[PDB]
Amino acid sequence: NFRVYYRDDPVWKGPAKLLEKGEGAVVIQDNSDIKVVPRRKAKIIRDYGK
Amino acid sequence: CSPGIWQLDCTHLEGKVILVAVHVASGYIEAEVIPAETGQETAYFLLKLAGRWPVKTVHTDNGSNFTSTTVKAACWWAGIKQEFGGVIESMNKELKKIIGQVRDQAEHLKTAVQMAVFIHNKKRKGYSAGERIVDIIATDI
Amino acid sequence: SPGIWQLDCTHLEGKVILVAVHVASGYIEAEVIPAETGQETAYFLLKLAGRWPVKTVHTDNGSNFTSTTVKAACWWAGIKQEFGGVIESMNKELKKIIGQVRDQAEHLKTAVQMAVFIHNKKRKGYSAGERIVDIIATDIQTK
Amino acid sequence: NFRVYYRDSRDPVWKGPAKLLEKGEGAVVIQDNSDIKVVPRRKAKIIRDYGK
Ligand SMILES: Cc1nc2ccccc2c(-c2ccc3c(c2)CCCO3)c1[C@H](OC(C)(C)C)C(=O)O
Ligand SMILES: Cc1nc2ccccc2c(-c2ccc3c(c2)CCCO3)c1[C@H](OC(C)(C)C)C(=O)O
Ligand SMILES: [Mg+2]
Ligand SMILES: [Mg+2]
């Protein structure tokens, strides 16, 4: 349902899988790497068109 | 082929970037002159296209704008599958041919581009491409 | 009538949004244009006329819609112009949807196109995007 | 079949539509409300009713 695009390198990475969401950060998994990303550095996007 | 398959590619004239989409089953096209051949401009073009038609799959070459993160985001949101790797290339040539035929009727290249899109989509074979896409999609409803 | 469109501009964030509505269906297209001029309106019209069978465009008397360049585009494309609340209602609907999704996008124009998508795809029992294709196809398939 | 929009009288506002009488190399001959005018090509925009 959700994919996350994010920054570390000024190019946006993704789609990363969304594991958990907090008010300040999101926990995501790209390939075999779990990252804690600030909310300002993350774009959570729904597959609205499905 | 499926009523939901589109091919996209860029061509170039007068130093400007022309982004072209073709509905494979009908030959219907849409095009825009974009200020730079970037993922951002391509993603914006796709969001507009997906709002008009039932865009299920887009096939492109591996141009960096087509493999970009922003295009991935747009296709995810709109529900578009991307496939990578000659209909649009043949269509690019035809579009440039029509543009050259009408170029001196317009000041700006983008004006001649949209005239050529109109001419291509309205020309009846018989149905025109513009009639074919609507007929194909309505039958798929 | 299958060929009647209404066009109008509305404004958000200091930017100009040019909106076209296919009256019979409720289908819309929109662009954020850099200025509310006849030049930009004529270019938008040439694009619209290439996609759909645009026979008549109804607008208010905004100077961009009465402009010489728009009259030139309508002459080339074969469009009849009529001057003087479907589009007004649609401006308010589009702005409502934009407001609902605005924080999901950096650029206003991205939110605009998300809002056009949302409006055109939402089913009532067809969507507006289904209605325009059905209406135009029926005209073609029965001639 | 053709309409001409043009600028004259040192006015940036586009006038017309006028009737096209001749498209020359450097000037166009037009008729606007029975007035015959000769305008430089660069001050004339000649547009065909392609959409019919
Ligand atoms: C700059 C410009 N100035 C004009 C001044 C007076 C009258 C018409 C124009 C046109 C024009 C408009 C519609 C049109 C065509 C040309 C040519 C045939 C199709 O319809 C343009 C065109 O530019 C815009 C379309 C962006 C306004 C152009 O590039 O030539
Ligand atoms: C600037 C920008 N940067 C990004 C960086 C990484 C990932 C995505 C984006 C998106 C984006 C793309 C498609 C999309 C949505 C947002 C939101 C949902 C619909 O699909 C944008 C958008 O801008 C462009 C569309 C011009 C690229 C935006 O305005 O936010
Ligand atoms: Mg290419
Ligand atoms: Mg208005």
Residue numbers in the entry:
A (entry chain C): 222 to 229, 232 to 273
B (entry chain D): 56 to 140, 149 to 188, 193 to 208
C (entry chain B): 57 to 140, 149 to 188, 193 to 211
D (entry chain A): 222 to 273
The publication says:
ALLINIs bind with high affinity in a small pocket at the HIV-1 IN catalytic core domain (CCD) dimer interface. Projecting from their principal binding pocket on the IN CCD dimer, the compounds act as molecular glue by engaging a triad of invariant HIV-1 IN CTD residues, namely, Tyr226, Trp235, and Lys266, to nucleate the CTD-CCD interaction.
Following extensive screening, we were able to cocrystallize the CTD-CCD fusion with two highly potent ALLINIs: BI-D and PIR. 22 and 15 residues of the interdomain linker region were disordered in the BI-D and PIR cocrystals, respectively, suggesting that the linker was free to adopt variable conformations throughout the crystal lattices. ALLINIs share three chemical features that are attached to an aromatic scaffold: a bulky hydrophobic group (chromanyl and chlorophenyl in BI-D and PIR, respectively), a tert-butoxyl side chain, and an invariant carboxylate (shown in blue, green, and red, respectively). Within the buried CCD dimer interface, the chromanyl of BI-D and the chlorophenyl of PIR engage in hydrophobic interactions with the side chain of CTD Ile268. FEP analyses revealed that the Lys266 side chain had a strong contribution to ALLINI binding, with corresponding ΔΔG values of 3.72 ± 0.54 and 3.63 ± 0.90 kcal/mol for the BI-D and PIR-induced interfaces, respectively. Thus, the side chain of Trp235 engaged in stable T-shaped π-π stacking with BI-D, contributing as much as 3.43 ± 1.1 kcal/mol of binding energy. Likewise, the side chain of the CCD residue Glu170 contributed more binding energy to BI-D (3.29 ± 1.06 kcal/mol) than to PIR (−0.28 ± 0.70 kcal/mol) due to stability of the salt bridge to Lys266 during the MD simulations.
